[PDB]
Amino acid sequence: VKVDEITDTTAQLSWSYAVQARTPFSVGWQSVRTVPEVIDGTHTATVVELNPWVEYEFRIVASGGEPSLPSEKVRTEEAAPEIAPSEVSGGGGSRSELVITWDPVPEELQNGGGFGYVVAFRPLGVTTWIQTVVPDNPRYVFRNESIVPFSPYEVKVGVYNNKGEGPFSPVTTVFSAEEEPTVAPSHISAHSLSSSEIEVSWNTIPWKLSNGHLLGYEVRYWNNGGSRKVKVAGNQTSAVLRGLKSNLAYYTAVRAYNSAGAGPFSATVNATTKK
CATH class of the missing domain: 2.60.40.10 (Immunoglobulins)
Known part of the structure; x- marks a missing residue:
């Protein structure tokens, strides 16, 4: 049971056959798809639709015969990420701030090393984006005197890693931190x-x-x-x-x-x- 060729979504294995697989993230073993889809009593095949930059074990099964010893722990090749983050939102904060937030992208979905987020924002009705890099604190704070208090910002968050860029979230609206009240209630x-x-x-x-x-x-x-x-x-x-x-x-x-x-x-x- 040896793995020879290896890519970001495919691995080549050599040994009616089925393939199981196991990762840090999988729960034990699960079946995987192959080329050929079906494996005739052929002593190699191609594991496909794998997750990039994820450690794999494989075992082989003949049938309901007793499964094989696992292969050496191998890691698939990296690739640009492909899933944008969810629940992009924010607001709140100290005067002169704009606070942006999102739910973190799981590690299985990061597809490479050097993963992080791109935070893009601009005052509503402005053409120039400001895009900056930030983890694992899925919160970005922009500080600038010029920020107008409680103003709407257009905000999108994207992803990248060492192999390149991934999708952006949709554009959504975020208000900057408000100015604190400056005056006190009269006639208490x-x-x-x-x-x-x-x-x-x-x-x-x-x-x-x-x-x-x-x-x-x-x-x-x-x-x-x-x-x-x-x-x-x-x-x-x-x-x-x-x-x-x-x-x-x-x-x-x-x-x-x-x-x-x-x-x-x-x-x-x-x-x-x-x-």
Whole structure:
């Protein structure tokens, strides 16, 4: 059972015959296709439709007779990769960033050494791509002062390896990191509801296109003697602090946040629980 010729998708073996095969990635042995498709009681044949740059063992079977000892561990020849990555997306991040992401391409599908990704991006409605090389962290961050906050980018990710280039993902749309809120909620107030609950109210903060999506408001509170925080949805504009101690003052202040961070805190106000 010897392997002589060897390519990226074919191997030549010599020894009714069937061929099994085994790789790091296969689960044990499986049949493989051959030339000839059928092997008449012919003492060589051609294993085909193999994966490039993948280590192989082969055994031969006559029939349901007892299988052969495996061949020497051989690795197939390399080739350009042929599968683009999936779930290309991204967004989020610190000011002046653009964050791009994708699911990683399996090692069996990389087809060679020196594998990596090409990340291509441009502001929506621009002609010049910027394409750069990155693994195995399937995340790319572009940093530049000039990046306009929360702008759409066209983004595609491709693959390559030492033997050449592979497909690109389809073009999809990704927004750059947003600018953080710069201002604080006006006219915050606080009244006691009971000896255990304080309600805090504030006003809607101005919001710009560059601020992206308002994730919510963070309410911080504390006392004196013996600190915490409650987050609240973005439509919400009010909050009840529960589980408080009786007859005691709390202080509190709010700020809005988005994916890029929090704005200044409002004024610090105070109310006192009953009893």
